[PDB]
Design a protein around this ligand. Structure first.
Ligand SMILES: Nc1ncnc2c1ncn2[C@@H]1O[C@H](COP(=O)(O)OP(=O)(O)OP(=O)(O)O)[C@@H](O)[C@H]1O
Ligand SMILES: Nc1ncnc2c1ncn2[C@@H]1O[C@H](COP(=O)(O)OP(=O)(O)OP(=O)(O)O)[C@@H](O)[C@H]1O
Ligand SMILES: [Mg+2]
Ligand SMILES: [Mg+2]
Lengths: 241, 385, 244, 392, 239
């Protein structure tokens, strides 16, 4: 039906649709992820403009693609869960075709490929989402964290954040996280992720959601009564020092 | 002690008032004098009041005079002017009583066409413009060379091109390259902004252009800088409602003046625009525009030259890498490089450092080129070109 | 005589104006110099406009005196406005080569030492630099007949006797400069104010050596680095106060 | 006369005005002696008598048109036939700008003076003649934006030494783009408060005139007036008005607006090389602006304004409720510092509404109930938002 | 202290002395040295010096009176009062403000932007260059161009070489550069170099033996009016 090209090379070389999707992502909720020796933590915030949103049926910001690999996004929430559905069905097809649980690298490559194709195909605007992929490969304990941009470029990050005010979280991670010396415990990773969030969220312990990913098919979602527990000693150690 | 203070303050005002009164908005300068009382000698000569009036048909001798609105007298000479010095269209200083043709006067020019004549030669030079060597060479060969050394054009027996376009993306150097010409020339440089040629009453733009061209022809060598001709540049088109037909009328009057039933007369004219696409093909036709310069985005060497020109001043730290700064700034017009230099200077001031270093320039170029990218002009107007 | 309190300065301005109104031609070609010596190194706005007025006037010697008074008035301040005026006068007084030469001398004096040195007669705390005043009077005494110094221009180096740098230098106790924040603003007198009012209006938080123009003082923003000398001008030595 | 220090009584003060009187009397004595020495028959104040008798009466008023062959000119009075008036020596030949108002003599009609306009029939409204009110203290937060605006518009005028030493021309113009009701106008009021320059405000609507001609005419007049009264801080506001709206009173329609915008984009940069005319525009919709205006070299530092955060909200509450007849029952900590979204305009609007409500009850003190009622009143009278649903 | 300029004399000296007495009893010598310089009593400055035991205050008072160019003799301090550290301070200033790069007199003229006897214009350019690079000890117009001096004729040659001494002011290094022009047989060149010798050490006084005095004293008695005039002018400038 619609064959008109929507992504056209600008006279300065950039693609206007892709660089507009960059800003569309820049207005999304902040999402941050860090990795330890054997633990990767995906931290995220929620919108506090409106209240009376329950927790049980509210769609989780971090969506489970498989038992060993999880995904978190930022930006336009509408389009991101489509990528989630495509990634899940592709993972099942990969299980059928290769008799092997999917790897983080392959899934991230597929997501970058589908975003690239939508930037390529005519009549379709590029995705306005930016995704974070975390998990553990089968029989491997190494946490892998991957970021996928709407432009289609993917890279590994020891600690990356996306969304609004991502510059502040980036510079915070640039000095309170060491790439060569990652935190050695799940508690330390969670504490770093939480302390990173208060630099932007500035209250909102109710709408701070954190997912901890562990090897051997272990994915947990810390509830509020533990997040506020971490926040207690974090704010206790903040002002007194 | 305030009992002293009272008359201490009183004396100030009293004495200043006394001095102002004793020494004694609309005058010249008494300290400069020059207002001598010999003016009675140049005052008793009641010939100073001279009715102005435009002469008309020369009855073979009797002259018909058309005093603006007092009368339409028919008058002879006044013995102070040769009989061949008066011709139809000239303005005559008609005598007040027993009217006579005393003194011919320069043709009437509209005041609004007078201040559009630069007598305050701007502060730029050809050294300022960088990364546009070929374009500046073409501009020279069109505008400056024919007046400076016309002997060669006589030896070859050719007519140098009279008329040159300066199309390009905004903030590339068009107005700068016209200001440089204005500074480095020796001929009159009548400047015309495109919007100024849009008056209210119908047909006034045609009079504007006609009087402007007459004034230009009055001088031996003149350069006209029709600028932002995008304003009066609309291609001829019909829409039923007669849309903006007055601007079209002004544009056709200009086209006829440039090349009509009468040669131009050494009136080399420079145009300049940011959207040359919307120009009527008649203007683009050679004869009124010969060369079409292509002021465009500079290359890496152009960027380096721009940085060197705009950083001749400034307390730059020795050892800065201008090549690296130029490379990390792709497809940015020279105005953005100037803004980068200004912001690099500013960032040092905010940190109180009296010398801006490379680490400062990198931050400034990141902030300006990357941060102020959504508000960029060189990406839309390039399509129009 | 009026080159004492600035109130006498301002009154002497009007004195010279009135004398220029009613004055014979020999006294005409010094009223510029009268403005210049009185207002040296501080290019106040109301000084050089009348000088410009008398620069285009007749009695070519008067014009030469006016431009030299500009040069003295703009001594070391790098005033771009007065530099533009001097360049314009260079364009105008180009036919007479003597006027061009004295104009170029005024240009050179305008940007003396690239702006790090001045002809200021009296410094902070109103000390009198007798050498500077001596040099200024030496160059102004006989220039009522400027052709004399046009012939014998060797006396134009007399300004180098009364010349001095104009800067701050936070010398360490051992004798080396050390960076420190210096508060620079327009000077204000502490006469009728009570308590501990500030001596600076319009402060700039400027670092180590700066160039305070005629009419500004200095004071240490930092609590530490106690200066032994209260008047922060010229060379200044500092000590580390243990507080904070 | 000079200024007098110190303010209070002091013997040195008395000495200062003693010097004042001494010098004043000395000028008076010098002028008296000089006059007495002069030949009164052509000196003293007989010059006034000669000027009056040569001038004649009454002096008519006309318009100059040319200065051909100085000592000669062609005036054009509204009714006279445009005489060939000669220029007398009393007039200053430097103010005879073509188009001025000369003073013709009654009978012989020779120019005996130039009448300066000094009218400003429309500029007087434009010319900022009394500082509005708020200083920079009244703006809560926004420290970065204040710093940028200061170093762009204030420091070049008050403190040019840093810029001339550094060797950079100051950033020409600044555009304050941001969300509506966030202090974009307050900051202009603040920079107008402390200023040593004329502040000619203009709003983009007034450039959308009705006649074809008077679109660029107004802009040319505004920038000429800014130039002559240098330096100038012209504050074109609601600059997006030219783009949108499409007013029926505009005869040209879109084309006249385009010509007006072209004249603006020229006058900002110009071939004329104007001097110290700083330009500060502010708009809600930066998107609908032709990028010629916002191009670097015309307005360099594009300051972004953002809705206040919780700490900024509490600071705004504190500064705006500083002049409150507040009862202790009102708690500022939980007053509006709720994190449920506000703006720089809401905080003042609810204060105004609560003050009005307290006035209605004639209660001189403010109750927490009234503050809460005004809070909810402001909340209902609020077009919430549209784009949040995309990310909701 | 503000009473002195306006208050009628001879009570001004009484006010100065009383304020000096107040300052000395309070150990605030920073202003006291200034009032002493206003009064001009050398024994009073000596008493200010004897009121200080800390050497640092001695150095700072030395700096103040050297800025005042007043020859007060004190042992162990003579370098500072002799203005011998001014040259190093000024070259440090030039390095810190990045003003080391010399400016051409053409750069001052900017005649290239405003454009469509050679001896007098060369004299003006030499004067401008001498005023510009004063104290920075570096220039490109005259230092590297020896034929530049010959462009100026007559008295212009004197100021040409004098510009070098002006550029090397407060610096004893310049004596080497000025030395070469002393050997030129032309009397005007000798006079110009000899006059510039004094400027190169103007306001600089080492404690024991001033080289400018030693080199200058021989040429004072020269029968040439120009050479002797330059000698006495340099003597006045240096001291
Ligand atoms: N090649 C160049 N050399 C030096 N400066 C340059 C160059 N190109 C651009 N610039 C700088 O950018 C500006 C040149 O553009 P200018 O301000 O003259 O407007 P313009 O290109 O005519 O704009 P518009 O097309 O919107 O009318 C100047 O401020 C100048 O300093
Ligand atoms: N940070 C602040 N500190 C103090 N007052 C503020 C602040 N932010 C906003 N205000 C108040 O908001 C009121 C209304 O906002 P204002 O008129 O300044 O907004 P604007 O965005 O410039 O306007 P407009 O959108 O109508 O063009 C002002 O009167 C001011 O007192
Ligand atoms: Mg332009
Ligand atoms: Mg507003």
């Amino acid at each position: 039906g619609y064959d008109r090209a929507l992504s056209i090379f600008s006279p300065d070389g950039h693609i206007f649709q892709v660089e507009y999707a960059l800003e569309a992502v820049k207005r999304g909720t902040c999402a941050v992820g860090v990795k330890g020796k054997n633990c990767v933590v995906l931290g995220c915030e929620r919108r506090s403009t409106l209240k009376l949103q329950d927790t049980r049926i509210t769609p989780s910001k971090v969506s489970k693609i498989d038992s060993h690999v999880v995904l978190s996004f930022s930006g336009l929430n509408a389009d991101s869960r489509i990528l989630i559905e495509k990634a899940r069905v592709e993972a099942q097809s990969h299980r059928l075709t290769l008799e092997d649980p999917v790897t983080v690298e392959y899934l991230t490559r597929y997501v970058a490929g589908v975003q690239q194709r939508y930037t390529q195909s005519g009549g379709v605007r590029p995705f306005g989402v930016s995704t974070l992929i975390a998990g553990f490969d089968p029989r491997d304990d190494e946490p892998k964290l991957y970021q996928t941009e709407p432009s289609g470029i993917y890279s590994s990050w020891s600690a990356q954040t996306i969304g609004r005010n991502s510059k502040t979280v980036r510079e915070f991670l640039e000095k309170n996280y060491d790439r060569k010396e990652p935190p050695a415990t799940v508690e330390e990773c969670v504490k770093l992720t939480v302390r990173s969030l208060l630099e932007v969220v500035q209250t909102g312990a109710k709408n701070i959601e954190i997912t901890v990913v562990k090897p051997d098919s272990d994915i947990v979602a810390l509830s509020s009564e533990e997040i506020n527990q971490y926040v207690t000693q974090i704010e206790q150690e903040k002002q007194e020092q | 002690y305030a009992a002293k203070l009272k008359q201490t303050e009183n004396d100030l005002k009293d004495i200043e008032a006394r001095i102002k009164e004793k020494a004694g908005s609309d005058t010249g300068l008494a300290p400069s004098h020059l207002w001598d009382i010999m003016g009675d000698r140049q005052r008793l000569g009641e010939e100073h009041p001279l009715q102005v009036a435009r002469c008309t048909k020369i009855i073979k001798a009797k002259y018909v005079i058309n005093l603006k609105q007092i009368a339409k007298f028919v008058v002879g000479l006044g013995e102070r002017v040769s009989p061949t010095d008066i011709e139809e269209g000239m303005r005559v200083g008609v005598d007040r009583s027993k009217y006579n043709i005393e003194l011919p006067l320069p043709p009437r020019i509209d005041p609004s066409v007078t201040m559009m004549t630069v007598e305050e030669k701007p502060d730029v030079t050809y050294s300022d413009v960088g990364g546009c060597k070929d374009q500046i060479e073409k501009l020279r060969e069109v505008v400056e060379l024919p007046l400076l050394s016309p002997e060669r054009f006589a030896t070859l027996g050719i007519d140098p091109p009279k008329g040159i376009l300066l199309y390009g993306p905004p903030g590339t150097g068009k107005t700068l390259c016209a200001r440089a010409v204005a500074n480095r020339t020796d001929a009159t440089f009548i400047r015309v902004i495109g919007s100024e040629l849009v008056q209210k009453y119908v047909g006034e733009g045609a009079r504007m252009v006609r009087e402007l061209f007459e004034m230009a022809r009055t001088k031996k060598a003149c350069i006209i800088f029709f600028d932002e001709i995008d304003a009066v540049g609309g291609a001829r088109f019909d829409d039923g409602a007669g849309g903006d037909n007055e601007v079209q009328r002004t544009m056709l009057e200009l086209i006829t003046q440039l090349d009509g039933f009468d040669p131009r007369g050494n009136i080399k004219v420079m145009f300049a625009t940011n959207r040359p696409n919307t120009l009527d093909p008649a203007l683009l036709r050679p004869g009124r525009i010969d060369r079409k310069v292509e002021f465009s985005l500079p290359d890496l060497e152009g960027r380096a030259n721009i940085f060197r020109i705009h950083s001749k001043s400034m307390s730059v730290e020795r050892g800065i890498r201008w090549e690296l700064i130029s490379r990390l700034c792709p497809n940015s017009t020279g105005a953005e490089l100037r803004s980068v230099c200004t912001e690099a200077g500013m960032f040092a001031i905010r940190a109180r450092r009296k010398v801006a270093t490379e680490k400062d320039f990198l931050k400034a170029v990141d902030k300006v080129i990357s941060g102020y990218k959504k508000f960029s002009s060189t990406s839309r107007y390039m399509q129009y070109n | 005589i009026a080159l004492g309190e600035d109130i006498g300065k301002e009154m002497s301005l009007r004195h010279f104006g009135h004398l220029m109104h009613y004055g014979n031609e020999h006294i005409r070609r010094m009223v510029p110099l009268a403005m210049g010596i009185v207002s040296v190194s501080d290019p106040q706005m109301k000084v050089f406009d009348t000088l410009t007025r008398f620069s285009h006037d007749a009695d070519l010697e008067v014009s030469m005196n006016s431009i030299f008074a500009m040069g003295l008035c703009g001594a070391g301040t790098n005033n771009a406005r007065l530099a533009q005026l001097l360049r314009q006068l260079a364009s105008y007084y180009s036919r007479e080569q003597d006027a061009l030469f004295i104009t170029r001398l005024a240009q050179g004096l305008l940007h003396l030492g690239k702006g790090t040195m001045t002809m200021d007669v009296f410094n902070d705390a109103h000390v009198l630099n007798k050498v500077t005043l001596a040099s200024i009077l030496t160059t102004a005494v006989g220039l009522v007949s400027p052709s004399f110094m046009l012939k014998h221009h060797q006396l134009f180096y007399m300004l180098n006797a009364g010349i001095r740098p104009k800067f701050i230098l936070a010398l360490n106790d051992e004798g080396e400069p050390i960076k420190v924040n210096v508060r620079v603003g327009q000077a204000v007198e502490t006469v009728g104010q009570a308590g501990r009012p500030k001596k600076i209006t319009g402060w700039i938080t400027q670092s180590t050596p700066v160039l305070l123009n005629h009419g500004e003082r200095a004071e240490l923003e930092t609590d530490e680095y106690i200066s032994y000398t209260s008047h922060i001008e010229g060379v200044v030595i500092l000590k580390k106060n243990p507080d904070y | 006369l000079p200024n007098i220090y110190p303010s209070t009584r002091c013997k040195l003060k008395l000495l200062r005005m003693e010097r004042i009187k001494d010098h004043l009397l000395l000028e008076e004595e010098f002028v008296s002696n000089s006059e007495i020495l002069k030949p009164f028959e052509k000196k003293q104040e007989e010059e006034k008598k000669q000027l009056e008798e040569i001038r004649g009466n009454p002096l008519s008023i006309g318009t100059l048109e040319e200065i051909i062959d100085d000592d000669h000119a062609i005036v054009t009075s509204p009714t006279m036939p445009d005489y060939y008036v000669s220029i007398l020596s009393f007039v200053d030949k430097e103010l005879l700008e073509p188009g001025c108002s000369v003073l013709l003599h009654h009978k012989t009609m020779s120019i005996v003076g130039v009448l300066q306009d000094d009218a400003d029939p429309m500029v007087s409204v434009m010319k900022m003649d009394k500082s509005p009110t708020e200083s920079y203290s009244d703006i809560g937060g926004l420290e970065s934006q204040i710093q940028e605006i200061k170093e762009s518009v204030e420091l070049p005028l008050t403190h040019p030494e840093l810029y001339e030493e550094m060797g950079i021309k100051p950033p020409k113009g600044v555009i304050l783009y941001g969300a509506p009701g966030t202090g974009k106008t307050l900051l202009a009021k603040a920079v107008a408060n402390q200023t040593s320059a004329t502040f000619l405000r203009i709003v983009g609507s007034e450039l959308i005139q009705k006649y074809l001609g008077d679109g660029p005419r107004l802009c040319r007049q505004i920038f000429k007036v800014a130039g002559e009264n240098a330096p100038s801080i012209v504050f074109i506001d609601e600059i997006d008005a030219i783009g949108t709206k499409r007013y029926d009173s505009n005869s040209g329609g879109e084309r006249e607006i385009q010509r007006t915008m072209l004249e603006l984009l020229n006058q900002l940069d110009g071939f004329d090389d104007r001097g110290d005319v700083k330009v500060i525009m502010a708009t809600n919709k930066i998107e609908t602006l032709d990028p010629a205006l916002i191009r670097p070299g015309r307005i360099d530092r594009k300051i972004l304004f953002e809705n206040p955060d919780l700490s900024t909200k509490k600071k705004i509450l504190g500064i705006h409720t500083s002049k409150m007849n507040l009862s202790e029952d009102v708690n500022l900590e939980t007053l509006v510092t709720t994190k449920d979204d506000l703006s720089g305009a809401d905080i003042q609007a609810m204060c105004t509404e609560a003050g009005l409500l307290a006035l209605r009850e004639r209660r001189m003190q403010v109750t927490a109930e009234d503050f809460k009622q005004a809070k909810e009143r402001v909340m209902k009278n609020k077009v919430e938002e549209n784009l949040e649903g995309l990310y909701l | 202290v503000a009473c002195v300029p306006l208050l009628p004399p001879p009570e001004d000296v009484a006010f100065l002395k009383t304020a000096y007495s107040i300052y000395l009893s309070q150990n605030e010598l920073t202003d006291a040295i200034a009032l002493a310089v206003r009064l001009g009593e050398e024994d009073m400055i000596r008493s200010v010096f004897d009121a200080t035991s800390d050497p640092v205050m001695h150095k700072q008072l030395a700096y103040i009176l050297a800025a005042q160019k007043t020859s007060f003799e004190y042992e162990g301090v003579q370098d500072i009062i002799g203005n011998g550290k001014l040259s190093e301070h000024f070259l440090y200033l030039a390095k810190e403000l990045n003003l080391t790069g010399p400016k051409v007199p053409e750069d001052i003229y900017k005649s290239h932007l405003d454009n469509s006897d050679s001896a007098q214009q060369n004299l003006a350019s030499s004067f401008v260059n001498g005023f510009l690079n004063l104290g920075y000890c570096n220039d490109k117009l005259i230092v590297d161009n020896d034929n530049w001096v010959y462009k100026t004729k007559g008295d212009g040659m004197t100021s040409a070489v004098a510009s070098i001494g002006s550029i090397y002011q407060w610096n004893l290094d310049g004596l080497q550069q000025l030395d070469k022009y002393l050997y030129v047989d032309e009397p005007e060149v000798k006079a110009g170099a000899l006059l510039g010798i004094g400027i190169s050490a103007s306001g600089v006084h080492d404690g024991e033996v001033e080289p400018a005095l030693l080199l200058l004293q021989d040429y004072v008695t020269n029968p040439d009016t120009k050479i002797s005039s330059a000698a006495i002018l340099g003597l006045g400038i240096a001291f």
